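Preliminary data (for renewal application), C60 complex.
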Amino acid sequence: NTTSSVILTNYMDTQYYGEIGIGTPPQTFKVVFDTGSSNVWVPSSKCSRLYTACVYHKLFDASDSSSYKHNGTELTLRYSTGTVSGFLSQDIITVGGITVTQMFGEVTEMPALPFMLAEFDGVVGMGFIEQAIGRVTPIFDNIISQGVLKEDVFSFYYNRLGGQIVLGGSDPQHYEGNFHYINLIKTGVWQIQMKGVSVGSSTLLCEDGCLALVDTGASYISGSTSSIEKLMEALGAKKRLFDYVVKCNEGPTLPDISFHLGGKEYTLTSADYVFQESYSSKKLCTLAIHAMDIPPPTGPTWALGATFIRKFYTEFDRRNNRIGFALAR
Amino acid sequence: NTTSSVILTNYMDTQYYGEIGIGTPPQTFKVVFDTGSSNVWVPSSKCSRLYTACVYHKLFDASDSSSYKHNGTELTLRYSTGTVSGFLSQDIITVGGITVTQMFGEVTEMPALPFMLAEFDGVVGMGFIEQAIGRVTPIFDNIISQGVLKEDVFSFYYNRLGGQIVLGGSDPQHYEGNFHYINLIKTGVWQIQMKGVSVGSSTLLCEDGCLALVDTGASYISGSTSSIEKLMEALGAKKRLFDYVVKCNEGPTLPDISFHLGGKEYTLTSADYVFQESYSSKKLCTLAIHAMDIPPPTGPTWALGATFIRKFYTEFDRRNNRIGFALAR
Ligand SMILES: CCCCNC(=O)[C@@H](C[C@H](O)[C@H](CC1CCCCC1)NC(=O)[C@H](Cc1cnc[nH]1)NC(=O)[C@H](Cc1ccccc1)CS(=O)(=O)C(C)(C)C)C(C)C
Ligand SMILES: CCCCNC(=O)[C@@H](C[C@H](O)[C@H](CC1CCCCC1)NC(=O)[C@H](Cc1cnc[nH]1)NC(=O)[C@H](Cc1ccccc1)CS(=O)(=O)C(C)(C)C)C(C)C
Ligand SMILES: *[C@@H]1O[C@H](CO)[C@@H](O)[C@H](O)[C@H]1NC(C)=O
Ligand SMILES: *[C@@H]1O[C@H](CO)[C@@H](O)[C@H](O)[C@H]1NC(C)=O
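Predicted structure:
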């Protein structure tokens, strides 16, 4: 049946984006594919320059598409970081060589913080309809509906060809060994149960289990405030407003951290979670983990983002309601 | 004797910048005048595009100035938000019509977060030599040395002509009534003692006194984490990663807050500290106060930034080692 690959661009290990086409003739946008949300949005032409982010990103022109079909229902999307607003609209979107008719948001309010840090123009949510603001049907469900993929699976490869997403399968040239599957805990959200976070060889957190959201659109690993505090305490890291830091010379003295998912320990070492700019002292190096209080019902949960995904080739399987991981290569 | 005015630009109540000229012929830069630090820096030509902030800001070309005199000593400047590095250099800088020969840093490392949010290109520190990285003499001391101002005072006017700094005096067309002075607590830093932070009519914080740094280069009012927690609890605000928020419809139900400085209560009302984008519910409005742990020896202290200054015309008096405040207009 069908399998499409979507080539991603790695921007500093913190932004992995690819391209989609909207409208007829197609208008191209760079978007992050986020498993933590389910709406599609891009910036709109109706966005005021009285919003800088809109001056520095690609804007979608409805009047230039033949397939545009107006909706206009208002839309507000509150993310962990960043809130965007605009109105709903409909047109054809093609990603990976597959064209679907999709309801997407045209954004007219895009805050500078965090959008001016953005190298992408928008977001394509790869979550479930239960997370979809406006009960709008997610792009992948529509894709599935079209009945064309070999399987109802999608895979993420984040590199250290900055990346690659495979719709309807996996690419083995990017993972070593077999996959290890963990079942969805609840349906409607990509979350699984975690059985412990260990430092070195000791279980410090989440000992009586906890939840992990597997989120491709989160650049770092997240944990609740209370947990990250305890963790950083253990690693010997300092809190900055924007990140946890460590003297760069100490980067390689930092213990390994491991996530107990399902039947395995998934370990990240100092090399996987420190942005080792220098081995120089008196120069603070960033850790790729930070705190994030995700409100219920979905939170509190950890969030295994790009720091994790970079090491573990991730498979999102919609037929079986489960997630598989294999070592990336 | 002499008085110069420096016209500032208000960018969203969060960035107040003006212009200086460097080199011969002069190279123009927009800089924030920060009373919280003492070095001068601008971006350098030797900055890599492999740093986006440098692609979007004005860069200083040493080779194009006749007056440039090479130094090259390395320099790292760690701010509350943002760390910049580069090397030291010397050339003439003119601000406000006064030319001095100054040692400034040429920045070659400028992180995206927070610099891509920057509408200015650099910083001009208006602090004391005790805060000067590299023991480099501050621009104002050099100005003073030139022996030309009417007085050793500088005044800040932040508007809601987005602003105006007066070197060597004050501009009365921007303040109502007389000034109220508070003595420096310690010399070498613009910090005074505070006698209480009240909510409504009750003293909630800093009851046995505390320290306040008067910082023009801080967009919001700052307090230590423990204090802001208690304060926000009292105002009924929610914590976002980047700011404290409140439902916009509640903006005007928020109590007044008052700072007991010296012999007066300085009160900010909901109107002064909420970024009232809408009176619409289900739409989070930003408070202009946040938490900031300033390490000792200077910290812990509060930081009365632009939110404060906008309401209270501030005078920094170097002859007498004190700070005066008057109502802005
Ligand atoms: C509208 C319903 C959305 C529901 N879901 C969410 O908000 C999920 C978060 C979500 O996956 C979003 C998806 C991204 C897509 C890119 C644009 C912003 C949002 N991620 C974030 O909010 C995460 C935070 C997080 C980590 N762990 C949990 N949450 N944000 C980030 O990683 C930020 C992503 C980003 C990167 C560059 C430019 C703009 C934005 C990076 S960042 O945290 O601001 C920083 C720069 C590392 C400090 C939560 C619930 C799990
Ligand atoms: C090298 C020695 C410096 C020593 N001094 C300081 O760092 C002082 C902070 C200092 O006044 C600096 C001066 C500014 C000048 C503009 C560029 C960055 C720094 N201010 C900050 O770090 C303050 C934080 C603070 C508040 N209260 C205490 N500290 N930062 C800000 O206000 C940020 C200023 C900014 C604005 C736009 C673009 C870039 C940067 C705003 S922000 O906090 O990031 C935010 C966007 C409101 C979240 C501390 C010690 C009082
Ligand atoms: C927009 O589509 C939504 C689907 O939820 C529908 O309720 C609404 O009526 C549509 N608006 C228009 C103008 O068709
Ligand atoms: C730079 O000026 C500093 C002043 O602290 C001095 O110690 C250093 O020697 C100067 N560098 C050169 C090359 O003159």
